[PDB]
Design an enzyme around this catalytic site. Structure first.
Site, PDB file in Angstrom:
ATOM      1  CB  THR A  20      -1.004   0.053   1.132  1.00  0.00           C
ATOM      2  OG1 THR A  20      -1.770  -1.132   1.261  1.00  0.00           O
ATOM      3  CG2 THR A  20      -1.981   1.275   0.933  1.00  0.00           C
ATOM      4  CB  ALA A  71      -7.757  -4.677   3.568  1.00  0.00           C
TER       5      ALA A  71
END
Lengths: 195, 226, 222, 204, 232, 196, 212, 195, 196
Positions: free
Chosen positions: G1, G49
């Site tokens: 990410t 997430a």
């Protein structure tokens, strides 16, 4: 300590080493060199876990210096780099791993091209026109890629590295307290002051 | 793996599935585990595949050296014995499992030898991941003293139930039938009970569906003067 | 020591069409190295053109599916028998996950079905909340295997027209329902040969406008 | 992280019709730091090629060690090393450090001179001769390559059709693996001439 | 978090054309010590089901009580219950599937491997697995514990798939379960010679055969084994 | 795996259960645990299988030399050679070995070697994981210097109890009779002993 | 990410990637990683997430609730602080977070707050969150200006995601930018990293150790 | 990580706090505030665990200001520091472990003198005219007291805090990226720009 | 500790060794492990001593309660009451319990509870961790419906044997004899049990 940098230009190679040595909770000295010449056109910078780094540096300096006087010829960077790679690999299968990782810049006088080898502690030789290690290796790869051109003079290479030092300074929490910056050129090895 | 050895009246049959698994991925669709220790002694491997292959070479060499030296046939007992001292040496850290069988002039023999260097002799043995799936078949369907023909059937049947009940045993079944006082018959791919299926579309495209960035010739041979 | 997880393998796969969608998965059940079942469908139709498979560790999976189906009944009872959208089914399933967030369910659920616009849809979950609308996601043990192949032949990734030297990339061809069935079958045939948790059979549910169809194809048996 | 898989890389070898292909990713990583966009995993000694995945240190260390062993060969026997013969050399050399092993996944490739046959073989961290002739894959994206190659692979292919299959097999695996995605080179190996083709592939 | 203290090992079962066989050794093994003799795994429930229970005998007893209250539950508030809302194997299975899971969720697992075998009142063969991981699956042939690894392949010859059910008869199936027992007796430590075997048929009804003995006995090949490998 | 060795007037009869166990799986159904190390001295193996196996062959090598060089070995002598290996490899090997043999001048002798290693002359020994259930039976029903038939019956009963109460005991009941008359094998099938 | 966000005069650029990585397996190369809190607030997903997906939609339900209840637009400050309390209650329970709530309102100007699961709420103007947060700052600072054009600002976020994505192993997939104005966000589409990286090479002269 | 410093003069409390917040191995933003005011003459500088700093500081801010409104007259520094110790004392025996150390530097209006307290994360208040916590106090407990005299003026004590900044920069390996200084006197609390 | 209860034709005799050992040191050498929990029902206690000392009284309180309200219980009924306590608190408590009672319609009955708690009806029970050496002995010299006089000798010999082959079983062999004549206690000193 945490910061080690290498950027290779058109006709020279530039290395930066941390001034500071943090031992504990006290930074015991704020001006101390973590580079040693191996040969008159090869400079090896080194960083890592303290205690291993000081001795290691002096052993590679000993053997390479001995090769050159023995043979009455100064060993090429290519040969030099491969030697440090042979000691590392042995050490990780030996009793005490040496956790010393090097940047070895030298101006190959035969090829008449500057050549920079990053070597990690595991012992993985890779030629890169960039290179750093540690967790200060993680900020400056991005900046170097953006602004680098395939070739430039050493003066512009001094400013470009000075950009890298400015970027590192803000976002890293550790005190490296400036850096000793050396040029490795074909007419010797010099120190150039930097802010 | 799944491994059986079935002693029969007139020799010994040793059979093993062809599947080789390294992890949950299948390493090879076809592999041969019936490796040749000596010309009349053959064995199949279970446990660490790497260790088993090295051991059959290492001990392969020793027994061949002794056979030349004494100028006579290799005994199956000499091979068992050598193997045990060796696997024991490292205290069973070495994870080789073998089912060793063969024919010699003191007769037909079928041994089990474990990692640690324990040994068992039976007339029906197993080791492997599917030792259990084949072992249940060997016990039931076996009777004391068998014909050559029947021996072959039972050996492969046991490994066959192996394929269907043991994930790590699959593909073809190899059989090595050693009759006493008579050359070994290595019978490769005796049975196929899982083929390969056809592909509904064709896969392959015209060239230039993979882009190239550079193309260059490299030498691999001597150079000339011209 | 008790451990409240296991594994029970199987592999499932969603492929979203252009007007239809499929959700397929082998019918093999395993524990360690024995085969539990030749044939247990993991792919259930749950009604209203929504197919759910909760594949992974079976126990969390059986409980999750049964819980999803009971939810659909209670949509009709409170909300006056109207259609549950594929998009709204996806958010709901997230709520079930979060409902025992703190005691995680080890399942990769894939649901599939049609929108209110008749466009295909495959919605794929991470085991404790997060979801995304995907064009292809393979869940389960041989997911690693099957996925690269789909990227190559459904979205045509890393392909180009012949002899243009990667100037013009392949355009996305219209995906037929017939075309897609062929494709799922070869994806599971390769998965069967090279992964020890797939084989026995395969159950493909075909979701169309005209209701849910089953087609079963057998696979080689290891 | 287990140390067999810290520094990335993949190798993939296939057979064709009296040609072999072997191909590799050029990614060197350290957790998540990409270091270099060139770092061949394929090395060649005479007319035999050897790919090596695994921990980066042993890749280099055996590169050289294998060079050393094969050069003493050539000179003593007045003959080049052959692919069938070279397989056993690998296996025994890794098993000398059975305990404490070099963490590598070699793939042999080569076309035997006096047989004419395409030949491929695999190994593992202890080292075993893995012996299927369809294709052998090893490395970080081992699981992924295994699937992909079955799906594509058709036994026996024309050299430039072989170019198509393997390179595509690689490109897809690389992108969907974390520790790959930078650079590739494919070796299409004939008995006359060996073509190295750097691919234009997508970066991470 | 319970651990097994005393445990039953192996229930084997298979499908055949007009009904099912469930069978198991009778033993409560206290680890390495074969502690308890005459322990009975197979409990008839309703009259169209036998539920066999292996695993913790401690959890078994508790399951036995819940099973008895399910029979009693069906009688309550029903004018009759022997064909009106008669107790099917499937109903029992579902009642058990729910509680093993519920308990698994509270982290005090009922430590058992359970096979419910029966016949429905719809003519349908029922044979299904539940265990202490709360995993369920339906399969034509089942076996638990040691017997999963060992004896279940052997039965899988007799029936591989669900289109060889009409070609297997009651004498033949019976024969296969007993050869399956013989093998559990030989090659499993927590398997006794003692065994019970129940046949639920949709036509014959319940036959519960108690205290059968393993026969077709092979030990006469044992005098030819001399030494461990090398010994004259 | 109960093994035992019992003195009687004319000798010693070593008894064994041929079950061999790797957890709940029986590794092999029928493996005699009575492994000859010399013509008139035989030994019994219990504990870890591999360790006892290793040790046994090492004993045969010492006693091959003892015969060769210095004339007949003894049971006493032999049991000392066990005690040496076990005691020096007390940190790597675990072997529960009962050594017994028949002398023509001392009659039958039994020396048990426990897992650490000692030597203990005793009329009778039981060792293994199957002997730890028959301790009660053996003392009460034993008397020194029975006649062979009576001797067989006592041994037979004890090992048959051991299968009933220990799940790592089983297979055929082996005995090896070490007498002046020779060495006699005896074997017994479960149909016979479950009852008795 | 690699998510990063930066205020300028023109608005707030929220730049995120689309490659979620499980480990050696790459979980997805197409995943939305701006959770659309309501028309006016954009959040980002990093950390966990699953946590980020659910709770940020939850912040969103609270945004509508607050709007109803006061008959005025939520404040940036109010939105963050609620999410900050929420995660602080559950701290140390398998909850992890890596969000910037980004908003531009006509009463407080552009504002960014980074929220973390451990109850940190920190006001900033440049943030970087992720495993690639290390890489993100680098490019981002050196080419940043508070006086920067809209077209250049988008360009700036395009070069940052690509520079991080190259050198990060867990980042790539596609480049999703969003520019938040006073009348809310405008989506600027999905740009595959692959294709986009080469164009940026020719024009800027960057990425010289990449030969193509 | 993180510094808080305190020195009390004859009419003021000078509290200072580090500008840096480092979460992870990256400095999360270079310039920040990291002090919140409980009352119009009472100041709470804080440092400690992540985001427990913020929640606790906001908790205490509500509750002291609540009493101020009801009585119609702000609490004293003796009362305010004490309140906070009570809270910490519950928090270390509670399922929720706060790990926040604070300095309470206020002006007592009723006494007419500054009072500087050191309150520990464990829950112990002691009045001290030079305190700190973390590894701030590891360098500057010695340095202050050397150059400190009972009597001071506000001009001296600020300059002595600048002296202490300098020491900290040399021998502490953490950067702070400057420090913020709010001066708390009788005339309220005001920001005064210092390095 | 060793405990048993052995049904005969007129009753059941409960038996116990009364050593209590806390590590290899003896806490008290006389503690009576046979406890009354109802008039014609007694229970034998083994395992972790504190835990069973606790459980026994809880059973005691249920069964006096049973008597006032619902008429006198039975041996089946009483065993159930232990089994709940053991089962539910199994994760907390370790308890092996032999439950023998006397009725005028079932005569002697003996129920055994292992450490996880399961109810089993047997014609005699043995429980302990000092009872693991009387197994081969106890299967042979038990005979159903045996004479009263033979019951004395059986339990005397069996526990005596337990005392030689377990160092934590020892001291006075105490016995509680349940018949339709009430309850008679008996005691056997080491001078008597050991020689016989």
């Amino acid at each position: 300590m945490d910061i080690i940098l290498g950027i290779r230009v058109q006709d020279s190679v530039i290395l930066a080493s941390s001034k500071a040595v943090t031992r504990g909770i006290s930074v015991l000295k704020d001006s101390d060199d973590k580079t040693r010449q191996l040969s008159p056109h090869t400079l090896m910078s080194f960083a890592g876990e303290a205690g291993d780094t000081v001795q290691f540096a002096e052993y590679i300096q000993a053997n390479i210096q001995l090769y050159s006087i023995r043979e009455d010829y100064e060993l090429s960077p290519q040969a030099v780099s491969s030697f440090v790679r042979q000691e590392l690999a042995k050490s990780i299968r030996s009793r005490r791993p040496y956790q010393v990782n090097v940047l070895i810049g030298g101006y190959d006088k035969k090829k008449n091209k500057p050549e920079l080898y990053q070597i990690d502690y595991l012992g993985t030789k890779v030629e890169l026109p960039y290179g750093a290690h540690g967790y200060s290796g993680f900020y400056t790869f991005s900046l170097l890629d953006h602004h680098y051109r395939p070739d430039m003079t050493t003066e512009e290479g001094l400013d470009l590295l000075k950009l890298c030092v400015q970027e590192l300074e803000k976002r890293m929490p550790m005190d490296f307290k400036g850096v000793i910056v050396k040029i490795v050129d074909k007419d010797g090895i010099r120190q150039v002051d930097d802010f | 793996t799944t491994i059986v050895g079935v002693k029969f009246n007139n020799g010994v049959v040793i059979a093993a599935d062809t599947r080789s698994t390294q992890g949950p991925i299948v390493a090879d669709k076809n592999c041969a585990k019936l490796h040749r220790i000596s010309p009349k002694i053959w064995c199949a491997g279970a446990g660490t595949a790497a260790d088993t292959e090295a051991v059959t070479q290492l001990i392969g060499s020793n027994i061949e050296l002794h056979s030349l030296y004494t100028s006579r046939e290799p005994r199956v007992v000499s091979a068992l014995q050598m193997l045990k001292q060796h696997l024991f040496k490292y205290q069973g850290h070495i994870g080789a499992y073998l089912i060793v069988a063969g024919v010699d002039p003191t007769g037909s023999h079928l041994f089990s030898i474990h990692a640690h260097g324990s040994t068992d002799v039976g007339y029906y043995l197993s080791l492997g991941s599917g030792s259990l799936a084949a072992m249940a078949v060997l016990e039931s369907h076996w009777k004391q003293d068998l014909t050559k023909e029947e021996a072959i059937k039972l050996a492969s049947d046991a490994i066959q139930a192996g394929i269907w009940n043991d994930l790590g045993s699959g593909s073809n079944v190899d059989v090595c039938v050693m009759e006493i006082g008579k050359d070994a018959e290595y019978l490769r791919n005796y049975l196929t009970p899982n083929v390969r299926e056809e592909k509904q579309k064709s896969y392959k495209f015209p060239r230039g569906t993979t882009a190239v960035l550079k193309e260059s010739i490299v030498n691999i041979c001597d150079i000339q003067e011209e | 020591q008790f451990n409240p997880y296991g594994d029970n393998g199987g592999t499932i796969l969603g492929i979203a069409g252009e007007d239809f969608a499929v959700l397929a998965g082998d019918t093999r059940n395993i524990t360690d190295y024995s085969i539990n079942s030749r044939y247990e469908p993991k792919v259930f139709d749950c009604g209203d053109n929504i197919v759910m498979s909760a594949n992974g560790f079976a126990a969390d999976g059986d409980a999750l599916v049964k819980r999803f189906k009971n939810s659909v009944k209670w949509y009709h009872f409170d909300h006056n028998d109207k259609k549950l959208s594929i998009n709204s089914a996806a958010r709901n399933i997230q709520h079930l996950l979060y409902g025992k967030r703190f005691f995680p369910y080890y399942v990769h659920t894939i649901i599939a079905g049609l929108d209110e616009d008749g466009k295909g849809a495959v919605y794929s979950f991470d085991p404790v909340g997060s979801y995304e609308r995907e064009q292809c996601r393979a869940g389960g043990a041989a997911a690693s295997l099957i996925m690269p192949f789909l990227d190559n032949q459904v979205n045509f990734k890393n392909q180009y027209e012949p002899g243009t030297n990667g100037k013009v990339k392949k355009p996305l061809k219209y995906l037929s329902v017939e075309e897609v069935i062929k494709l799922v079958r070869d994806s599971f045939t390769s998965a069967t040969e090279r992964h020890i948790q797939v084989g026995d059979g395969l159950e493909i549910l075909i979701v169309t406008k005209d209701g849910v169809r089953k087609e079963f194809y057998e696979l080689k048996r290891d | 992280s287990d140390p067999s898989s810290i520094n990335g890389g993949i190798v993939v070898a296939m057979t064709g019709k009296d040609c072999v292909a072997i191909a590799c990713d050029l990614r060197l990583g350290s957790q998540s730091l990409g270091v270099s966009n060139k770092f061949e995993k394929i090395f060649h000694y005479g007319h035999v090629f050897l790919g090596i995945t695994g921990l980066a240190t042993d890749v280099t260390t055996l590169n050289e060690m294998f060079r050393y062993k094969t050069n003493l060969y050539k000179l003593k026997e007045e003959r080049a090393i052959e692919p069938e013969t070279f397989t056993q050399l690998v296996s025994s050399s890794l098993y000398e450090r059975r305990f404490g092993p070099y963490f590598v996944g070699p793939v042999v490739a080569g076309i035997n001179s006096k047989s004419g046959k395409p030949f491929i073989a695999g190994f593992d961290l202890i080292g075993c001769i893995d012996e299927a002739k369809d294709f052998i894959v090893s490395g970080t994206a081992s699981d992924q390559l295994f699937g992909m190659c079955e799906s594509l692979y058709e036994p026996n292919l024309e050299p430039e059709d072989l170019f198509e299959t393997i390179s595509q097999a690689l490109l897809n695996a690389a992108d969907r693996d974390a520790l790959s995605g930078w650079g590739a080179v494919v070796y299409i190996i004939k008995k006359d001439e060996v073509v190295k083709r750097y691919l234009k592939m997508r970066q991470d | 978090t319970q651990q097994p203290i005393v445990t039953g090992t192996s229930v084997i079962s298979m499908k055949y054309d007009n009904g099912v066989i469930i069978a198991a050794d009778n033993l409560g093994s206290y680890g390495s010590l074969l502690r308890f003799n005459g322990v009975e795994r197979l409990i008839p429930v309703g009259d169209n089901t036998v539920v066999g229970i292996s695993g913790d005998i401690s959890d078994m007893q508790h399951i036995e009580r819940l099973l008895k209250d399910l029979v009693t539950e069906n009688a309550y508030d029903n004018p009759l219950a022997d064909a009106e809302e008669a107790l099917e194997p499937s109903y029992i299975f579902e009642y058990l599937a729910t509680v093993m899971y519920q308990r698994r969720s509270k982290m005090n697992p009922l430590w058992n491997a359970i096979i419910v075998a029966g016949v429905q009142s719809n003519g349908d063969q029922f044979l299904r697995y539940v265990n202490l991981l709360g995993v369920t699956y339906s399969s034509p042939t089942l076996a638990t514990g040691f017997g999963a690894h060992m004896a279940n392949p052997l039965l899988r010859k007799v029936v591989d798939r669900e289109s060889d059910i009409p070609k297997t008869t009651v004498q033949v199936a019976e024969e296969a379960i007993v050869n399956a027992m013989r093998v559990l007796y030989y090659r499993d430590a927590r398997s006794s010679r003692n065994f019970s075997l129940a046949i639920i048929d949709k036509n014959t009804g319940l036959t519960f055969k108690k205290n059968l003995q393993v026969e077709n006995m092979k030990w006469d090949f044992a005098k030819d084994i001399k030494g461990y490998g090398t010994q004259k | 795996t109960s093994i035992m060795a019992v003195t009687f007037k004319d000798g010693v009869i070593l008894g064994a259960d041929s079950r061999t166990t790797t957890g709940a799986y029986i590794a092999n159904r029928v493996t005699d645990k009575l492994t000859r190390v010399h013509d008139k001295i035989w030994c019994c193996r219990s504990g870890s299988a591999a360790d006892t196996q290793a040790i046994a062959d090492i004993v045969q090598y010492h006693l091959e030399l003892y015969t060769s060089q210095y004339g007949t070995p003894s049971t006493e002598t032999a049991a000392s050679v066990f005690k040496e290996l076990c005691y020096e490899n007390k940190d790597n090997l675990t072997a529960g070995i009962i050594v017994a043999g028949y002398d023509d001048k001392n009659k039958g002798e039994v020396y048990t070697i426990p897992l650490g290693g000692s030597v203990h002359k005793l009329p009778y020994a039981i060792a293994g994981s199957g002997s730890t259930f028959i301790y009660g039976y053996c003392d009460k029903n034993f008397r020194e210097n029975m006649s062979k038939e009576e001797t067989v019956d006592f041994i037979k009963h004890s090992l048959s109890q051991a299968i009933k109460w220990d799940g790592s005991s089983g297979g055929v009941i082996r005995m090896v009779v070490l007498t002046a008359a020779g060495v006699e094998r005896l074997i017994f099938y479960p149909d016979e002993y479950e009852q008795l | 990410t690699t998510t990063l966000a930066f205020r300028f005069q023109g608005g707030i650029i929220v730049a995120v990637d689309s490659r979620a990585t499980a480990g050696n397996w790459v979980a997805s190369q197409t995943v939305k990683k701006v959770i659309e809190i309501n028309p006016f607030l954009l959040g980002t997903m990093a950390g966990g997430a699953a946590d980020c997906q659910f709770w940020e939609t939850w912040l969103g339900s609270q945004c509508r609730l607050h709007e109803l209840r006061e008959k005025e637009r939520i404040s940036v400050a109010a939105a963050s602080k609620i999410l900050s309390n929420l995660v602080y209650q559950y701290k140390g329970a398998g909850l992890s977070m890596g969000t910037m709530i980004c908003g531009y309102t006509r009463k407080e100007g552009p504002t960014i707050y980074y929220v973390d699961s451990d109850g940190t709420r920190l006001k900033g103007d440049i943030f970087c969150v992720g495993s690639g947060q290390t890489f993100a700052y680098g490019v981002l600072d050196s080419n940043y200006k508070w006086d920067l054009s809209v077209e250049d600002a988008l360009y700036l976020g395009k070069r940052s995601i690509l520079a991080a994505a190259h050198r990060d192993a867990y980042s790539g997939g596609s480049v999703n930018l969003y520019h938040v104005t006073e009348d809310g966000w405008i989506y600027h589409g999905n740009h595959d990293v692959g294709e986009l990286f080469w164009k940026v090479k020719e024009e800027e002269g960057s990425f010289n150790n990449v030969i193509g």
